[PDB]
Amino acid sequence: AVGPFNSVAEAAGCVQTVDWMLLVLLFFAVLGGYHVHFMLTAGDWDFWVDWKDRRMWPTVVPILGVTFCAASQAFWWVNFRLPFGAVFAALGLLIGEWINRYVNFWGWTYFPISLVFPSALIVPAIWLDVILLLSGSYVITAVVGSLGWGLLFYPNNWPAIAAFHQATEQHGQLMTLADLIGFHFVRTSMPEYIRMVERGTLRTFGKDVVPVAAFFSGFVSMMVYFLWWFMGRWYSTTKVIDTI
Amino acid sequence: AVGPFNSVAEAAGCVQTVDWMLLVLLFFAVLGGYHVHFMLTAGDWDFWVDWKDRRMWPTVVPILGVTFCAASQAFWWVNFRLPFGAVFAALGLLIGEWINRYVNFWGWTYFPISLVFPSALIVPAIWLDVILLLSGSYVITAVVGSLGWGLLFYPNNWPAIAAFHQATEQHGQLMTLADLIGFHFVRTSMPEYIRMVERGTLRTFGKDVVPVAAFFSGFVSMMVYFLWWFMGRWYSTTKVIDTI
Amino acid sequence: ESVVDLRGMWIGLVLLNVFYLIVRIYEQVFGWRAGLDSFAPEFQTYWMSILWTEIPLELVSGLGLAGYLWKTRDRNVDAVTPREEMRRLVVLVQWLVVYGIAIYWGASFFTEQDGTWHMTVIRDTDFTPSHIIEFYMSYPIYSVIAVGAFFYAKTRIPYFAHGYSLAFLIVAIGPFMIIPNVGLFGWMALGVFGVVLQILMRIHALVGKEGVKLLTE
Amino acid sequence: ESVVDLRGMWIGLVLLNVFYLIVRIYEQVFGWRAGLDSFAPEFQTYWMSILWTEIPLELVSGLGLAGYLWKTRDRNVDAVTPREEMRRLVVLVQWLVVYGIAIYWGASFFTEQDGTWHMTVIRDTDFTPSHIIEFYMSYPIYSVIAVGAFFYAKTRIPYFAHGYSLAFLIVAIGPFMIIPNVGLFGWMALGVFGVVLQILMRIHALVGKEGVKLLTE
Amino acid sequence: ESVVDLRGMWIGLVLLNVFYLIVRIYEQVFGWRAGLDSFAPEFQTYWMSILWTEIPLELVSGLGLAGYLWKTRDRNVDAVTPREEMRRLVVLVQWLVVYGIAIYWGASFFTEQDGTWHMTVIRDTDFTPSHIIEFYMSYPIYSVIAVGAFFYAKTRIPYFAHGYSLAFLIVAIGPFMIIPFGWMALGVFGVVLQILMRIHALVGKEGVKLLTE
Amino acid sequence: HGEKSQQAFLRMRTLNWYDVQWSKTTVNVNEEMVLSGKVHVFSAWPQAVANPRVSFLNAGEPGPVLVRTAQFIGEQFAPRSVSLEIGKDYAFSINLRGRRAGRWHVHAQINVEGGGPIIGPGQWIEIKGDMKDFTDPVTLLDGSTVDLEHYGISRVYAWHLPWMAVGAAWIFFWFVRKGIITSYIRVAEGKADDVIGDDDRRIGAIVLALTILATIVGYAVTNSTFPRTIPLQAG
Ligand SMILES: [Cu+2]
Numbered sequence A, B: 001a002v003g004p005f006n007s008v009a010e011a012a013g014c015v016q017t018v019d020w021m022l023l024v025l026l027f028f029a030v031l032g033g034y035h036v037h038f039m040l041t042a043g044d045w046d047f048w049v050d051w052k053d054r055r056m057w058p059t060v061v062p063i064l065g066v067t068f069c070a071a072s073q074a075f076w077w078v079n080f081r082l083p084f085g086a087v088f089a090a091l092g093l094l095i096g097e098w099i100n101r102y103v104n105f106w107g108w109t110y111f112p113i114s115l116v117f118p119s120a121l122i123v124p125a126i127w128l129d130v131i132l133l134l135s136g137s138y139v140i141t142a143v144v145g146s147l148g149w150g151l152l153f154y155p156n157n158w159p160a161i162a163a164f165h166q167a168t169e170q171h172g173q174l175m176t177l178a179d180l181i182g183f184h185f186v187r188t189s190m191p192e193y194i195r196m197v198e199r200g201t202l203r204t205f206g207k208d209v210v211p212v213a214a215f216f217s218g219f220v221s222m223m224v225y226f227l228w229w230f231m232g233r234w235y236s237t238t239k240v241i242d243t244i
Numbered sequence C, D: 001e002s003v004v005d006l007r008g009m010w011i012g013l014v015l016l017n018v019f020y021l022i023v024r025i026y027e028q029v030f031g032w033r034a035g036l037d038s039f040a041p042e043f044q045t046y047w048m049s050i051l052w053t054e055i056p057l058e059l060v061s062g063l064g065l066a067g068y069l070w071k072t073r074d075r076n077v078d079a080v081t082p083r084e085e086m087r088r089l090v091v092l093v094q095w096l097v098v099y100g101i102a103i104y105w106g107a108s109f110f111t112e113q114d115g116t117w118h119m120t121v122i123r124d125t126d127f128t129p130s131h132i133i134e135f136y137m138s139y140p141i142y143s144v145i146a147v148g149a150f151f152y153a154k155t156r157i158p159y160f161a162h163g164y165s166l167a168f169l170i171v172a173i174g175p176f177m178i179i180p181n182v183g184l185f186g187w188m189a190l191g192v193f194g195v196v197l198q199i200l201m202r203i204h205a206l207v208g209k210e211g212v213k214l215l216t217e
Numbered sequence E: 001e002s003v004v005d006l007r008g009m010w011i012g013l014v015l016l017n018v019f020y021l022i023v024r025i026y027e028q029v030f031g032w033r034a035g036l037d038s039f040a041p042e043f044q045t046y047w048m049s050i051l052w053t054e055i056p057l058e059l060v061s062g063l064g065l066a067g068y069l070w071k072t073r074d075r076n077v078d079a080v081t082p083r084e085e086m087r088r089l090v091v092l093v094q095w096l097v098v099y100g101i102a103i104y105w106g107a108s109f110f111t112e113q114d115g116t117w118h119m120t121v122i123r124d125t126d127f128t129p130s131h132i133i134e135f136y137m138s139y140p141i142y143s144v145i146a147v148g149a150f151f152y153a154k155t156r157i158p159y160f161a162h163g164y165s166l167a168f169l170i171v172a173i174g175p176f177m178i179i180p181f182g183w184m185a186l187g188v189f190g191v192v193l194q195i196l197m198r199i200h201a202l203v204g205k206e207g208v209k210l211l212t213e
Numbered sequence F: 001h002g003e004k005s006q007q008a009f010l011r012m013r014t015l016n017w018y019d020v021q022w023s024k025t026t027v028n029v030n031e032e033m034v035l036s037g038k039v040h041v042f043s044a045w046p047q048a049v050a051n052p053r054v055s056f057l058n059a060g061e062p063g064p065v066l067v068r069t070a071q072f073i074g075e076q077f078a079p080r081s082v083s084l085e086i087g088k089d090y091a092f093s094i095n096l097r098g099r100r101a102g103r104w105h106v107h108a109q110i111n112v113e114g115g116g117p118i119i120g121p122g123q124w125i126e127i128k129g130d131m132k133d134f135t136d137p138v139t140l141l142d143g144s145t146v147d148l149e150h151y152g153i154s155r156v157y158a159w160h161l162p163w164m165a166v167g168a169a170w171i172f173f174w175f176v177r178k179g180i181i182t183s184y185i186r187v188a189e190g191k192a193d194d195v196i197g198d199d200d201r202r203i204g205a206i207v208l209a210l211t212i213l214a215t216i217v218g219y220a221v222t223n224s225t226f227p228r229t230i231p232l233q234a235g
């Protein structure tokens, strides 16, 4: 009566239950691939409270972060005009991480969630997504999209982070709580010195360490975006080939 | 009988003498290109008995070695379904090297063959070729092919190598025979320190040094293999172009 | 009959989530006090059992699943009717949902978990508890399910049969190249983008203008 | 008359192997005691002679071969009969066998030989004995033979004439980019792969179904 | 009427070279004594004024130019007559000449200029005198002109309208990837070639072969 | 605990460990044992291991079974990296507050920059109590106290989980509003444009305006609470 479906209900029914199966298999999927990549590159800055500094952390993470959000956007927008690409990836990741920090960093090994909590991405992801929604252009996204993505990162992390940048005096020396949480809850293999956080330079002038970091993160995210968008495209390939 | 040949003998004869001319000119050919490439990169670990260690040499050589085998395969198996590609290249090199070590390292400059003998490749080469013979797939070869090639390397060298890893006491210090061969027959430009052989690390655990090397060499050779297959292809190009 | 079954998917989802749940529980209990000295013999009984078991058990499980699917391959595949193809696609979207979750576990869960166990030992070997589960268990498992979804589509669906979707080809094979880069910018398998698009094209074909435009705008 | 001559090839093979045999012998005798101090005047008479000779000798040898082959170019090449084309190909396979060997000497023999001389001096210059032979002799030589094979095919065979086989183009010119990386993954000339395939395609065409399928399965 | 005006181009050329001439002169006089300590308040009045002024001024000047050119877009562009297209092309060649010079100042003059100011301070900030003019002035300016030339062609020429010339796209956008062997915008090669293709077309065999060999 | 597997000659010719002592081989949760000892920096330091110019003192223990309250080496409070001179001896000590009930084998440990970990001696350390009872705490410069075991985790979730929920809204919204298959097919045919076009874009521009506003607020608030803050102290 509407072949190869019998009823109109057998049609619209099977559609709505495939719509879920994809959405789900696709959800992770990218979460799996995004997490493995990110964890392998942006570490590390994301595991530890005592890595989240003002220079490295709000530079490397937006830059390594924009990768799958770009390819995911290339996937959902081009094929379905669905404006949730970036968020579809950013969220994927966060769940994946949070679940692990809870179930394992803490549940299994018992580091406080104050030591092992992830970087905040959903606000940037949203900006990215809406910029591709408003302009329909990946090129515009690649510019004003990723530049937002870069800027917003630290602002949208501050709320969770401030708390730990409170100062304590310890044995006649200054520490931030964060340094301390690190120092206290003992990691077998994490000597301060492995960190890769800001340690001062003579070419710093200000009072400027974060804005520069974020603008830098912003401009670099532009190239990564492009590259990853066209990689999202190459990954969407329906090409069939003849032999192996 | 069969124009542009007169007889059936004038056909079948010319065919069989071109068949040789090809196989020969093709034999070296790839020997030349394989050697230069390999000598330049994998050195060096191949010239000297006191570079053939447990870590470096059984890593770099498989990895640098699989390149022309993969490309030679791409050419022989795709166009002629002939299952000797790897072996065609592996042997090529060995002849080219051995000739040199004999006529030159020894014939011209007089280093004992015990110092200047090459790395054994022909066992892996075979594994690699037979995998492509059995499965008809480069994809499978790339994986189980190169992973074998990787693991078989040290094994198939041990027979020639063990003899020199026998211990000697020299002026109150322990040396292997190899070390000593190197020490004895004086190389004008080869200070121990230039070597690049294993020297120990704190992150070694065992008793494992060679297994990890070979497995590593295996998993990496998968990537080199692919790349060099498609490059074997790119080089097989019959494209004619219009201007320069 | 009915296009959409699902019964098999739930068998997969349940049979899996359960298994990892058991494994994660077990590692709670024998990770802590039993897998800290690798030179102890309590390690040979609680952790080195698993490694030595699952490898030949995975290997067979793999070729079995492959072999079997090729055997029960549909030898007159081009004949498949629109309702059977539809049904066959909804099986394939199934295989991909079980693939999806096998990935979640083995790439996110047991992967980042090794991250926390790094900060728990200084290391006896590369056969730690987490390594056993991550590298030699969760990875090979989602790698088997992958080969499955691939062989299944290859032997049930005209398109995937005669061809080799490149997207799929990658998705199934990429897994054997996670070992390099590294012991744990980048080359990845979101190839599932290509595969669901290839599934989606068949679904758009298998409805006339009738379904297409009309039923859905 | 006859398709297969070879006489020319032997002239090449013999004329070459001999020459290098002489040279390797010479360097056994004057390498040792005569080529160890480059500031000595025994170096100017036994080694710096060769360098100053061969370069303009190679340069002319090169252009000669090219110019000449272009001159004696077949101006009505498309007319070539299947028997004459087959003869012309078997000459071209010849050129490539003399090329093959000019490569063996220049790229394996005298190249890896420099590696052993490196361990014999500390160095006076970059005009060592082996450098003279390797870089300024064996390489240019095989580079000339290459240009030859290329020009020969360009002026005798319809296909290679009007065109520029890309494979061949590379095989002839790649030689002028060995000097870089290094001055003393990667970019190489196994371009002969394409060239013999291009040769092989003409051979497969130049036999009807008669030869093809029948005579040979 | 006439294909070749130029009046507009001289307005551009003259309006630019003058402005920069002023700016360079200004920076001779206030660069020296006024822009050496950024913590001094003479820096807030003579240099940090310009920075805060130009950016929103450039941002509006930018969108203005683009909005306007799109508006005044020729809604029946395929209709264009061979004489009107030729005029439109010769305007577009104008835009590019004003572009060419906005590039020269922005990328050669005020850019290599910063290299000599580098050897004159040890640095208070990244808002040095030269940085203000180079990054926040000369660069944005030529970037506006570029978007101009691009939009102009897009809304006056059948070819550039309906399409997106790849060269031109690059030329107009690459400017926003200077902030971060090389990647550059000589994309003008493609654009002039695209211009030249229409000129070759808008002469019959008559002009073409005959008039010019 | 893996010292067994490390290369023999390296463990011998780097750090030479002596007079290592544990305050108490039993503690209650919150009870404050201390591990101490002396180490001589071997004189012919192996090539394999970075010079110890950059090193870090550590409690070799399976996670935070004991919080570390402080530690000292070379007569300094050493929560950061320190230099060890080849040929000299340094004395150290680590103040360890019990935290997780069990029987752990606790080590003195030092890691070298480009070297890896060097493990000293280790002694079993029976802890008893209930982890639920473990506290820190710690004093701010402002004078107040905070229990570290818990401090801040509240505020974190407070900001993370809402946003994750927001993210999931955004997705479920578009999903059930225009399907995967529906929207695929629309796009696959002519349009597209059915799938988006304003006022889908009105939703977007609004959602974004709220997002940024949610940020400026959350910023300003968390800027009012904690208006002090200093950067991580390193080096
Ligand atoms: Cu690990």
Ligand SMILES: [Cu+2]
Binding pocket: D114, D118, D128, D131, D184
């Ligand atoms: Cu040399």
Ligand SMILES: [Cu+2]
Binding pocket: E114, E118, E128, E131
């Ligand atoms: Cu500057």
Ligand SMILES: [Cu+2]
Binding pocket: F001, F002, F105, F106, F107, F122
């Ligand atoms: Cu221990």
